[PDB]
Each structure stands twice: as C-alpha cells, then as structure tokens.
C-alpha cells in the first residue's frame with residue numbers, strides 16, 4: 001500500500017498493457033497482409049488463369065496449410081458477386097441454390113448476392129451462403145468494393161460459434177478495372193470478396209491467456225468508432241477489477257472507418 | 269561529463285535496439301511469405317495433377333505480392349533434377365541447364381537445381397543450376413535435410429554484385445513420410461524455393477532514411493563462427509558501442525547488430 005511502490009505498480013500496468021496492444025495490432029496486421037495475398041491468389045489462379053487452377057479442394061488445402069500465416073483468423077472464404085439476372089445460370093452451373101445465412105434456406109429474390117464458392121474447412125458451413133444476407137457482412141462488402149481496401153465490421157456474434165468477433169473483407173476485381181478508378185467503376189469491375197473471421201472471443205483469449213502475468217490483469221478492447229456508443233470487442237466489462245487505476249493503450253487495426261482502444265486494470 | 273554521458277548512452281541503446289527490431293521484423297515477414305510460396309508450389313505444381321502452375325502464373329503472382337517480401341530482391345523456384353533425368357528435362361523445357369558463373373552448358377553432375385520459375389526481377393536466374401554456386405549449393409542441401417528455411421553467409425549476389433544473404437526453403441513430394449529421417453527427406457525432395465536478401469541496397473534503404481543516421485555507425489555481423497565474424501552490413505572497420513540482438517530464424521547461423529557514435 002506504499003507510495004513510490006504505486007508509481008511502479010502503474011509503471012508495470014503501462015508496460016504490460018502497451019505490450020499486449022502491440023502484440024494484438026501486429027498479429028492482426030500480419031493476418032490482413034496474408035488475406036490480401038489470398039485475394040491476389042484468387043485473382044491470378046482462378047480468374048486470370050485459363051482454365052482456373054482453384055476448385056474447392058484446392059482452396060481448402062492451400063488455406064489449411066497456410067493457417068499459421070493468419071493467426072487471429074478462425075477461417076477464410078471467397079464469395080463471388082452474382083447479380084439477379086445471372087442467378088439461375090450460376091445455380092445450375094454449381095448445382096446448388098444460394099442460401100440465406102440466418103436459416104440456410106433458399107434465398108429470396110435480391111438485386112445481387114455474394115454466395116461463398118470456396119471455403120477453408122474450418123468455416124465450411126459458409127459454403128453457398130449469401131454473405132449479403134447478414135447486415136454486418138453486407139455493409140463490409142459494399143465498403144470493400146467501393147474503397148478498394150480491406151475493411152472491418154463492428155463486433156458481432158459469428159455464425160455457428162456465436163463467438164464475439166469482427167469480419168475482415170477484401171475486394172477482388174476483374175481485369176477490366178480502369179487505372180485510377182472511380183467508385184462507380186470499382187463496383188462495375190467487382191468479381192467478389194475474400195473474407196476472414198477474426199474470432200476475437202476465442203483467439204484473443206488464447207493469445208492473452210498464455211502470457212505471464214495474465215491472472216493479475218484485466219484486458220478489455222473497445223470499438224470507439226462512435227464516441228458516444230462504445231462497443232465491447234473483447235472482455236467481460238461487468239467483471240470486477242481495480243477501479244482506482246487504469247491505462248489506455250492505442251490500437252490501429254488499419255481501417256480508417258473504425259477506431260479501437262485497449263483498457264487494462266489490475267484485478268484488485 | 270556526466271549526466272549528459274548517461275543520456276548519450278540511453279539514446280544509443282534506444283536507436284540501435286529500434287533499428288535491430290525493424291530489421292528482424294522485416295526479415296521475419298519475408299521469411300514467412302517465402303514459406304507460403306513454398307506451400308503454393310507444393311500445392312499447385314505437385315499435389316494437383318496435371319500441374320496447375322507455370323512461369324507466366326508464377327511471375328504474375330510474385331510480382332503482385334512483391335510488397336509482402338521487403339528486403340528480398342526476388343524469388344525463384346528451382347526443381348531437383350538427377351542426372352538420368354537431364355535429357356528428358358531439357359527436352360521438356362526446351363533449354364539446357366547452365367552454370368551460374370559463365371552461363372555455359374553444365375558439365376555432367378550427379379544432380380542439379382535448375383531454376384524453372386522466376387520473378388521477373390530475377391529473370392537472369394532461369395535455367396541456372398543453383399548447385400553451381402557454393403553458397404546456394406550448401407543452402408539447398410541443408411534446406412532439404414532439415415526441412416526448414418536456411419540462410420547463407422554474406423556473399424555477393426549475381427548480376428548486381430550486391431552483398432547479401434540467400435534464403436532457401438525445401439519443397440517435397442507428397443510421398444514424404446511423417447517424422448521423416450534425413451534420408452527420407454532427400455528422397456522426397458522436389459525442389460527449392462529461394463530468394464535473395466539484398467542487404468547492401470535494401471537494408472541501406474531501410475536504415476539510411478532514419479533520423480539520426482548521420483550520428484551513428486551501424487554494423488550487422490554474421491557471428492556463426494565467433495572467431496571469424498563476417499560483415500553483413502556496414503564498413504570494414506575493425507570505445508562506446510552497443511550490441512543489439514538479431515535472430516533471423518536459422519539456428520545454424522548467428523547474427524548481431526553493433527552501433528557506435530562517430531566522435
């Protein structure tokens with residue numbers, strides 16, 4: 001309970017929190033970069049190559065063998081853009097119907113869809129699901145294709161596991177995409193979307209739980225995109241912790257549309 | 269003297285340590301992306317039949333992903349070819365296996381590692397037997413016997429003559445047994461995925477743009493043989509220094525960064 005010992009108590013909190021934030025940010029960055037590579041893989045080996053080198057078996061094998069490259073992701077998949085005019089054709093060729101994510105039921109008529117055609121086996125239940133039939137995923141698809149860049153959702157409970165996480169989506173464009181394209185041109189040139197699920201609830205707990213001093217510290221991560229409406233991304237905020245001291249560590253997950261932060265406290 | 273001396277030491281440690289972290293991190297990112305390319309060649313060239321990868325495709329994919337491999341000047345894939353197979357191999361590729369030093373047709377050897385796929389930045393490697401250079405040859409043998417990424421000593425690279433280090437990963441056939449012996453690894457070897465760390469240019473680019481670069485002297489040494497340190501980066505010069513840790517991921521090799529003030 002001494003002074004000066006409590007200067008050091010805070011010094012250790014600051015160092016522990018800052019290190020955890022740097023680890024989370026670095027590992028997410030590594031994962032985004034490898035998802036970018038997979039988007040380029042689909043472009044080069046599925047679209048550009050005549051004939052395609054990628055079937056479901058191939059995508060499953062390659063993604064399984066490279067899972068270690070994407071540490072915070074529970075799975076990756078590729079969804080192809082399908083406009084309604086094309087839907088009957090697409091379904092006949094694939095020998096399956098486009099399904100809704102809420103029920104796995106045949107999709108109602110929509111202007112367009114994003115059905116998963118390739119999946120890592122860890123997320124095999126995504127196959128044939130229209131990723132535009134979930135609101136988080138729909139919004140991410142639109143912003144991915146309009147901006148040309150990787151985008152993140154708000155935190156929400158993922159399919160099957162119901163774990164609290166965030167989704168990462170990258171656009172894949174046709175070779176007809178003009179140089180210095182307008183948004184309207186990006187949309188017209190969209191082939192599909194390469195997505196991954198950051199299972200924060202399971203995988204961030206696994207990362208943090210293996211670190212020395214974990215039992216001493218409470219770690220929470222927030223999506224603070226809207227200042228007046230912070231959203232829990234990781235942690236049990238209700239859980240009892242030391243109310244007298246906290247530290248805020250910076251996080252940058254790389255999507256300028258979203259903002260995040262980590263807050264650490266001692267248990268008692 | 270003297271509180272100012274303390275601050276001067278603290279600045280040196282901080283400057284050197286950050287540079288060391290930046291270099292280790294960039295190396296690590298490149299090593300990891302090279303490992304992914306090794307897996308890509310295995311999946312697309314060997315596991316799929318017929319092969320679903322070729323030079324055009326490898327060149328496009330590696331060009332588009334060059335950003336994933338900082339400090340690498342280029343990547344190439346060399347296939348293992350034993351002498352009995354040479355005639356068939358050369359007929360299939362419509363070219364002759366060449367020596368690295370003169371580009372002359374290779375004399376007969378027990379085996380060869382001719383480059384079949386290359387990033388266009390290292391297009392001059394195509395058809396060269398990578399076993400015809402002693403640093404690359406040793407790297408290839410150790411990659412295939414250990415099953416893991418390996419690094420060379422610093423040496424001067426082809427074409428540019430830049431001082432650098434080569435990274436080599438083995439690629440195996442799916443006939444590789446589980447928990448293989450070294451003999452089983454050799455037997456199951458398909459080829460070698462390599463890249464060149466151009467230290468002289470690309471590490472200079474990384475470190476030389478940094479603030480305070482003019483106030484310090486930075487060296488990186490390969491200290492695999494403690495009695496014969498080899499310069500990887502810096503000048504040939506033999507009080508106040510600081511040693512910062514580097515780990516480039518190959519247990520066969522050891523490295524360190526040393527930083528010093530000028531005056």
Ligand SMILES: c1ccc(CNc2ncnc3[nH]cnc23)cc1
Pocket residue numbers: 075076077078079116123126131134137157158159167168169193194195196197
């Ligand atoms: C395209 C393909 C895949 C994805 C990734 N989303 C996703 N992945 C896994 N689990 C889910 N539950 C809700 N959304 C997801 C996004 C776009």
Ligand SMILES: c1ccc(CNc2ncnc3[nH]cnc23)cc1
Pocket residue numbers: 343344345346383390398401404424425426434435436460461462463464
């Ligand atoms: C297989 C394929 C490519 C490599 C990489 N070597 C290499 N790459 C580039 N330049 C060099 N000059 C001397 N050696 C090399 C190693 C194994």
